[PDB]
Amino acid sequence: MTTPSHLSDRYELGEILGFGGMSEVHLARDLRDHRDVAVKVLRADLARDPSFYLRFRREAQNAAALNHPAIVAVYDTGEAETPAGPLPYIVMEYVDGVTLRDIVHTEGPMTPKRAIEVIADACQALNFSHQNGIIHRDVKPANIMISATNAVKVMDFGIARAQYLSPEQARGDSVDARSDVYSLGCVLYEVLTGEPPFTGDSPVSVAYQHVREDPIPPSARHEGLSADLDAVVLKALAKNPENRYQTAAEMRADLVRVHNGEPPEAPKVLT
Ligand SMILES: Nc1ncnc2c1ncn2[C@@H]1O[C@H](COP(=O)(O)OP(=O)(O)OP(O)(O)=S)[C@@H](O)[C@H]1O
């Protein structure tokens, strides 16, 4: 079962780049604009499943389109008619790079300074989104890439539908910029320690832990991590949104302090 060689007459597919729970991403040439793009398409094997067809249209295809250097731009969406059936797709900015999920998997924890740099840049992407009224809602290692020229790129903003969810998302409360802060804190935790804050035999077990259980401070999970870093990470991961960083920009400012070896403003954490 293949994905067609073309999507409309416009997009000529090249190499496969990646795949996920519901889609496959291909490098493509836009023949109209002479541009290499990434085309995300419903996976060829799941393509006959109505439940996935629906998810793809309602979720993947609804990624918000934002113009920022740290955000993967969304160019186009559509549906190709395939001998098998209608095949939905979304066209976006091509990133020659690797997701943070892959980096952690293949290389282990990032050095602390590199981790701070990467997450500080993610904060800029989130600030821009928030300033433009969009909550990301699904910040996770899989939604952040680093390019071959070391630029951070954040993707797949503003979609509806456990390792990275905020307590409020677990509870069905209001989700806001502070929920994105929390979830980015989880990512930061994971790139520093090599492990996410909470692991469980199920998503309900992980959700429970987000609501109810204190994360182990990063310096307890892994060597070379300071108490200043514990302080920043543990603030982003506060259960009560009022005790977290209130904005992505407030979080970034403490990251930049720690990068420059200045004390963060986050409450001290002792171990
Ligand atoms: N902008 C893009 N440029 C290059 N590669 C990309 C791009 N977007 C996605 N990829 C690659 O394609 C893979 C799959 O994309 P995802 O968005 O994770 O798939 P998905 O099935 O829509 O996601 P979920 O959240 O698993 S359902 C990623 O891990 C990347 O390797």
CA angle (111 as vertex; 109, 116 as ends), nearest 5 = 100
Task: For the sheet with 97-99, list strands across it.
Answer: 97-99, 144-147, 152-154
* Euclidean distance between CA atoms 157 and 263, whole angstroms: 32
Torsion over CA of 186, 192, 193 and 197, rounded to 10 degrees? -10
Nearest to 186 by CA among 204, 169, 172, 161: 169
Q: Which residues on neighbouring strands pair with residue 78, listed in sequence order? A: 89
The reply to whether ligand 1 has any atom less than 6 angstroms from the CB of 18 is yes
Task: Give the pair of three-digit tokens for residue 165.
Answer: 């969810």
CATH 3.30.200.20 residue ranges for the chain: 1-94
CA of 25 to the centre of ligand 1 (A): 6
- Active-site amino acid positions: 138
What are the start-end ranges of the E strands in 83-209? 85-92, 97-99, 144-147, 152-154
Burial of 271 (0-12, 13-18, 19+ CB in 10 A): exposed
Q: Which residues on neighbouring strands pair with residue 177, listed in sequence order? A: none
The reply to whether ligand 1 has any atom less than 6 angstroms from the CB of 95 is yes
Name the closest-CA residue to atom 23, ligand 1. 20
Report resolution in angstroms.
1.9
> With contact defined as beta carbons under 8 Å apart, do 157 and 177 qualify?
no
Residue the block writes with tokens 């994360």: 215
Burial of 68 (0-12, 13-18, 19+ CB in 10 A): middle
Residue 128 CA: distances (Å) to CA of 69, 135, 160, 202: 10, 10, 19, 34
Task: Give the pair of three-digit tokens for residue 115.
Answer: 């981790």
Annotated binding site: 17-25, 40
* Euclidean distance between CA atoms 234 and 218, whole angstroms: 8
Annotated binding site for ATP: 17-25, 40
Crossing angle for the helix pair 112-131 and 177-193, nearest 10 degrees? Answer: 160
Return contacts of 12-20, CB within 8 angstroms, 24+ apart: 13/39, 18/99, 19/43, 20/142
The CATH number given to 96-267 is 1.10.510.10
Pocket test for ligand 1, best of 23, 91, 104, 149 (most atoms within 8 A of CB): 23
- Residues, the chain: 271
CA atoms within 13 A on the CB side of 68: 22
The CATH number given to 1-94 is 3.30.200.20
> With contact defined as beta carbons under 8 Å apart, do 146 and 92 qualify?
no
* Euclidean distance between CA atoms 189 and 197, whole angstroms: 6
CATH 1.10.510.10 residue ranges for the chain: 96-267
Q: How was this structure determined?
A: X-ray
Torsion over CA of 113, 116, 118 and 124, rounded to 10 degrees? -140
> With contact defined as beta carbons under 8 Å apart, do 5 and 16 qualify?
no
**Which region, left, alpha or beta, applies to residue 108 given φ > 0 means left and ψ of -120 to 50 means alpha?**
left
Separation of CA 33 from chain center: 28
Task: Give the pair of three-digit tokens for residue 11.
Answer: 């997009």
Closest ligand 1 atom to 72 CA: 1
Name the closest-CA residue to atom 18, ligand 1. 20
* Euclidean distance between CA atoms 260 and 263, whole angstroms: 9
CA of 20 to the centre of ligand 1 (A): 6
CA of 23 to the centre of ligand 1 (A): 7
CA of 42 to the centre of ligand 1 (A): 11
